[PDB]
Amino acid sequence: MFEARLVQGSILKKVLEALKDLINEACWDISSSGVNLQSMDSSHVSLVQLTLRSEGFDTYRCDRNLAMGVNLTSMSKILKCAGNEDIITLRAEDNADTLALVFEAPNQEKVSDYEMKLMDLDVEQLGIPEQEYSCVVKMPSGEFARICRDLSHIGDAVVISCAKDGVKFSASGELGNGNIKLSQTSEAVTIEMNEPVQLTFALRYLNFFTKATPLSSTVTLSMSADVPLVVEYKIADMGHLKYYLAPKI
Amino acid sequence: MFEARLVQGSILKKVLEALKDLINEACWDISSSGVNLQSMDSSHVSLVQLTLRSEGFDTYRCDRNLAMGVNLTSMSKILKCAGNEDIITLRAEDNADTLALVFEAPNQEKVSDYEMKLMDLDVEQLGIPEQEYSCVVKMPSGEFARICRDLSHIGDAVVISCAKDGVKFSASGELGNGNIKLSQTSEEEAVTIEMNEPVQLTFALRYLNFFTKATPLSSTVTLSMSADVPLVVEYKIADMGHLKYYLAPKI
Amino acid sequence: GIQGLAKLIADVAPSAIRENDIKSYFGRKVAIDASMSIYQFLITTSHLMGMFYRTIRMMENGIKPVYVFDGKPPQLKSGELAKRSETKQHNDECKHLLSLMGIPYLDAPSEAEASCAALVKAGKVYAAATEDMACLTFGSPVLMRHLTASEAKKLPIQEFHLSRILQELGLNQEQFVDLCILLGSDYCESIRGIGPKRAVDLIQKHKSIEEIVRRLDPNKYPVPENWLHKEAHQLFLEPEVLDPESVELKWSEPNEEELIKFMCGEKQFSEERIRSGVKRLSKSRQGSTQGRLDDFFKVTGSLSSA
């Protein structure tokens, strides 16, 4: 019997708001460590990784280990029946093909209950290639959302370039070109660099990876040349959320 | 010569906003008791009784038992052209088949004077029975609309179980089964399930969404049911009278 | 049935006719005219193929059917016409495919259509489903047309309300009867004189043909040879029909084998289908649903705008 309680359930709604437009079907891994997701998207580009650790979990129980399969869309659908102070109680059995979900209000007068079915699946897995990263940058989140949305209006790709002093994103489209640089802060931004590197990315999936903005206040971009870039967000004191995109050659 | 005034006049906008999606026409019965409206639905499942006493008005002159008919959605489109603080005035001549609406302003600087023509009516009319309703529930309207809309994303028709301790709003759907339980809470946010004998009934949740269109229309909503009879939802139009929606039950 | 009737109504009281979708009839028990029905399918496994499929579709939509057969025919016009000069094989082959599907059937004492009406006007069934307006003449309150049409022919069902017809034409049932006769009854010869619309009017200020005749009398509008304008007017009133309460129809469960072993086998026909068919019939086991306000509140009348 697996049981779990998260009293910041609104977070999980936004967590499902990370996926329900990006990937529709995935597999959920449950161990004593917590909840884990390592999925591939439909156009075979993004490596989507999500970690929630059970140190941040307020109430936990996991004897037998689970590897289930969920349509993430309808889970986001059934998660939207609770206000923004509520508690989610998850409970899944070692022999039953379900999730039993209890929306618990803090004022325990209106309590919602759902029983969602399961699907055993064969989604191919891909892990994290651990390497170094020659340039890391940490920036605020709404400004990056504004930047990626705006450069999606001029052209369909983005050429980024980082160096000793600042960073630059550029794009060229039908009505001309544009670029925006930022400078090293001496709310702020940081760069730790090893080489001035330039690469090319497709803004459609940056507009897909953007939607995890209100799960964090800041955002981390970690990158080198000839290897994919990591867009990284932090789930507060429980885990994190990575989107991996391989740059255009 | 019919000539009537209403200072807190947002209620007329509020009732015809909750009237036009249900039905396309209305049988306006103007008596010396005031403004009344009994009318069926279009699907032969439901009914509206609007009663507006004269003592809920400000200034009144009724000389005729007028029995007219209004095409509702064009009247609502005309009612969309006046604010909610604005005073609503109606004028009517018993020979001139038109309605003269006068929208006064609270600052009186903007005057509106609109006119909608008449069309004839031969609408059916049946009488409601008066009986014992085994469950009468006083509820907040916003919470009620919130709950039935929360059930709208599961399935289509609702099953209700009305008993002593709690009340049971259950439903099925394409994602499975669900139900929410309520209890009494020990003036507007207070609830009360007054009960003699527990029952179970079937109703249409889409008609509950149609009935909760009058969510801002009262202090509290009343839900009156018994065995195999039309549910009457009540919105007590404050100091004015009341609007009662009947729903003939399902089999 | 009655000639040019549908058009007459359509042309003078459309409020009594509606074009509804087969689905809206979910939960309704209807009386059908097996005879005509069986015939419709023909115009030789058809007498049952359609008797099969159609009844499945009628079930799939929640409509609970009761096929009806005729007994000993009465004095119909062209009926006993060849007598002026002087089978049930593929018929009962149907009275079988039915009980083998759990579908009722009744042997009318004479004309089913009259029996159907008999039921309808007893709450025992909702409407009568035939193609002949007769039912209306026989006093039936609701008549449904096209309920036996092909799944293809996307024709909606046509409903008729007797009590609305009587309403407009401002005339009692009986008064309506005479109209049908002068319109073109299949029981007796009409009167070469009056026209569709014309025949109405006369009846409107002459509550009977008996009074209509004595009025117009020239050799310009002669009354038929052996005119039984009476005998007929009677049949349409008090026909020969099995009492409504006499029995209670009960839709049973279809017997897949026993039936499929008396269809695809004994009458040879694509198995795959008649199997998925019996399957579907078994699924749609019900129809009645959602009540009306009428069911609980007496109708007050009508408020008419000034």
Numbering used by the authors:
A (entry chain G): 1 to 186, 193 to 255
B (entry chain E): 1 to 186, 191 to 255
C (entry chain H): 2 to 44, 60 to 102, 134 to 353
The publication says:
Three DNA polymerases (Pols), α, δ, and ε replicate the genomic DNA in eukaryotes, with the latter two possessing the proofreading exonuclease activity required for high fidelity DNA synthesis. PCNA encircles the duplex DNA and tethers Pol δ to the DNA enhancing its processivity from few nucleotides to hundreds of nucleotides per DNA binding event. Mammalian Pol δ consists of a catalytic subunit and three regulatory subunits. The catalytic subunit (p125) harbours the polymerase and exonuclease activities, and a metal-binding C-terminal domain (CTD).
In addition, we present the structure of the Pol δ–DNA–PCNA–FEN1 complex at 4.0 Å resolution. To test this hypothesis, we reconstituted a complex comprising human Pol δ, P/T DNA and dTTP, PCNA, and FEN1, isolated the complex by gel filtration, and analyzed it by cryo-EM. Flexible-tethering of FEN1 to PCNA in the holoenzyme is suggested by the cryo-EM local resolution map showing lower resolution in the FEN1 region (6–9 Å). FEN1 sits across the template strand and in a proper orientation to bind the downstream duplex DNA when Pol δ encounters the previously synthesized Okazaki fragment.
